[PDB]
Amino acid sequence: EKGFEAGDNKLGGALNAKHVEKYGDNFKNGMHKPEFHEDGLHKPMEVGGKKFESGFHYLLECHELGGKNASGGYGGPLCEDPYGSEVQAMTEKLLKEADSDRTLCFNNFQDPCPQLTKEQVAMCKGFDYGDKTLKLPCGPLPWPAGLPEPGYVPKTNPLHGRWITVSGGQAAFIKEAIKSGMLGAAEANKIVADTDHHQTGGMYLRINQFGDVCTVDASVAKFARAKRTWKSGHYFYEPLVSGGNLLGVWVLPEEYRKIGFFWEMESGRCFRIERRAFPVGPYTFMRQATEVGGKISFVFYVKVSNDPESDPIPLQSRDYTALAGRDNAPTNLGKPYPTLAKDLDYPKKRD
């Protein structure tokens, strides 16, 4: 109910209405829309009776929503102890190996990255991102040079399952900020912006994958929408709990790696990103690497189950809005990217 996953398990499982009944009206129609003190997350707030020392404290509690197995734990049949010392050591080694890895997407992010102008960002301020019938005010978003074209269809659905974050989780960064006692507005604002969206991870991911189409359950502590479905090469909209708005795309050009990008509309920045799955010892890990302005942020997850224990939702896209109705819009080097500016779920009107 409430647009969330069907189920009443109070101990765990995919996010459902019973899990968030306690947060007054913050959760509705599958969306998480909380109200943080006008000033910033450093200032306190109150949700359905419970007062929170700060907005960060609310986010910390929201991080615990939706990623647990049926009995309230985080482990699964493929890895019963994701937070154990064994997994930690493998993760530390992968982290160190990540700095020397020269196989990253976009030619290790050296490909020329597009950026929206000051005017373009200004035009979009206040735009109704939920209206599928509107063209983005700044015209077609630039596709990032070096993005592979779509067409490949994964054969083994390797992303399908439940993944638990073992490095780069946002809660760890929030706990650091909280320990910093007295935070100022500027300070809180920077923490939110620096760890926003894919710069850090939620505590889990549940993925339903069928070839080049996936449904992904992500942390509502970070993303306003609990569940999203997208298709390789097609746009989708990510409203953020921070108030930010992203229009991005995932391409699945290979069997074990996704390559994509997300336009953060309020800053005009194009974050480029990849997710790859690979084995280490008896486990399967996923490394997420997000880059902007020369800075690469890594998130690591360990696969705890082949079952996401969450259902897919209908397919959609936001190619019309994002490309402002322009078929085969270009990359920033003037090369046409083969995606038509029509939403896969047309004529649905709202997103």
UniProtKB/Swiss-Prot annotation:
**Record family assignment:** Belongs to the calycin superfamily. Luciferase family.
What does the domain comment read?
Composed of 3 homologous Luciferase domains: each of the individual domains are most active at pH 6.3, and there is very little activity at pH 8.0.
According to the record, the segments passing through the membrane are none
Q: Where is this region: Luciferase 3?
A: 1-351
Q: What else is known?
A: Dinoflagellate luciferase mediates much of the bioluminescence in ocean surface waters.
Its ancestry begins with:
Eukaryota, Sar, Alveolata, Dinophyceae, Gonyaulacales
Q: What is this protein called?
A: Dinoflagellate luciferase
Question: Which stretch of the full sequence is covered here?
Answer: 868 to 1218 of 1241
Q: Where in the cell is it found?
A: Cytoplasmic vesicle
